[PDB]
Amino acid sequence: GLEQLEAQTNFTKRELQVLYRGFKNECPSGVVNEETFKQIYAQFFPHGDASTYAHYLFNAFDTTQTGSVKFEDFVTALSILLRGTVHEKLRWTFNLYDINKDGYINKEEMMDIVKAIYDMMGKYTYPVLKEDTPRQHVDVFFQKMDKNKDGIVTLDEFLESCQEDDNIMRSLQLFQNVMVE
Ligand SMILES: [Ca+2]
Ligand SMILES: [Ca+2]
Numbered sequence: 001g002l003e004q005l006e007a008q009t010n011f012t013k014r015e016l017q018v019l020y021r022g023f024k025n026e027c028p029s030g031v032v033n034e035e036t037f038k039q040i041y042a043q044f045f046p047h048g049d050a051s052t053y054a055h056y057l058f059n060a061f062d063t064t065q066t067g068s069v070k071f072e073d074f075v076t077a078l079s080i081l082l083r084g085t086v087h088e089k090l091r092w093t094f095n096l097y098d099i100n101k102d103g104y105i106n107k108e109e110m111m112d113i114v115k116a117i118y119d120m121m122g123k124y125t126y127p128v129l130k131e132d133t134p135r136q137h138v139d140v141f142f143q144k145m146d147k148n149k150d151g152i153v154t155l156d157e158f159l160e161s162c163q164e165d166d167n168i169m170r171s172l173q174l175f176q177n178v179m180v181e
Contacts, residue, residue, distance in 0.1 A: 005072055009079035016075065023071050032069040034058050044178045048122030053175065056113060060096040082180040087159070093172050094158050105153040110138045117175065129171055144168065 006013050027036060034055065041054035061069045061077045080092050095101075099109045114134040118125055131137040145153050145161040145168070162169040 001072070005075060009075055010083045011075065011079060019075055019078070020071060023074060030071065032061075032074065033067065037061070037069065041179075045120050045122075047124050048120045050120035053113070053116035053120045056096060056099070056116060057175075060092070078180065081176050089173065089176070090159055090162055090169070091155070093176055094155050096176075097172075103155070105158070107138060107142055107151065110141060110153075111135065114138050114141075120175070128174055141168070141171075 002013060002016055005011075006016060009016075011019065024030060026040065032040075037058045038051045038054040041057060042050050044050065058069070059065075061073055063073055063076070064070075077092070080088050084092070094105070097105050097109060097113050099112065111134060114129075114137055117129065118134045118137075121129065129137055131140060142151075142153065144165070145157055147157050147160070162172065
């Protein structure tokens with residue numbers, strides 16, 4: 001299904017082969033489980049514990065929710081993360097934070113993800129994420145993004161906030177980018 005795969009992503013046929021080669025190179029069995037994913041991701045952050053964030057990142061890749069990320073799942077997410085539009089990329093990130101796939105983000109979900117990011121960055125969570133604690137960042141995040149103040153952040157509130165603030169966007173995307181470097 002390389003032809004079906006090429007039609008659905010931003011990659012050519014020969015780029016897909018270069019991607020497959022690298023995929024098997026790192027995943028001999030042809031599929032990636034959580035641990036393998038956590039191992040690979042861990043390296044992007046040696047000064048912290050990125051396993052919990054890598055956990056959320058894994059599920060977002062595992063769209064079929066099979067606990068096993070196939071090559072197409074991998075390319076499908078890369079197609080977006082690597083060469084998707086800001087709109088497409090932000091939607092991917094919103095979906096990552098929307099853990100229960102409510103269609104919305106609550107403070108509890110925000111906390112989980114953000115607590116994962118702080119642990120990942122360790123004590124070197126530079127201005128990327130100011131504020132001493134995750135709880136303090138989450139409250140400042142929601143205040144700015146939850147425009148109608150109903151304690152919920154919808155996709156639209158999320159996009160508008162990001163569109164009107166280069167800072168909010170980075171604190172969200174930064175971690176998705178490290179992978180498409
Ligand atoms: Ca939700
Ligand atoms: Ca709201």
